[PDB]
Amino acid sequence: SQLLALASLLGQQQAEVQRCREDLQKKESLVMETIAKIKALALEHHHHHH
Amino acid sequence: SQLLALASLLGQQQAEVQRCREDLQKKESLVMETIAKIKALALEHHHHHH
Amino acid sequence: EFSQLLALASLLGQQQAEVQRCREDLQKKESLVMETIAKIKALALEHHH
Amino acid sequence: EFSQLLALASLLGQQQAEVQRCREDLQKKESLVMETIAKIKALALEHHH
């Protein structure tokens, strides 16, 4: 039936969405670690002088 | 110093980003569960007849 | 009878619309972060070169 | 000397640009999912009403 083809395609397309989402969340975590590094560095330059 | 104010603002703004991201990921998981329910239902209607 | 599937498809549209709304909120909040980052970078460039 | 901070700020721009590129990819792949969902819903509406 056409339902079988669409359900198979939906499962494959949803699997591609999850693969893309997991790759995106990893790159988002990399951005967060970089931002936290900039914040800690700015706090170092502040408390070092003052 | 101005570095202290910007670092404090950055930490607060980054905290708001993480709160929004965690809320978004929960709503994304709800979409995934609904899609998986539609796929399983379409497979039921297929194998029930055929 | 596909009433349960149609009810889930109707709910999916509401859920997806909320996801896109939250994604717009995340973009605006991330832009504010990058605005503060640019202020920190401009301060760093002044006292370094 | 803010060389380490400036180097991290330069890396952040590359990382953020990749995040936005991946978000565009996710939107296109999600739209394909919703296209198949609409085909399933149209099939369901035909055999239900």
From TrEMBL, chains A, B:
Superkingdom classification of source: Eukaryota
Residues of the full protein shown: 477 to 518 of 523
Family: Belongs to the WD repeat coronin family.
Name of protein: Coronin
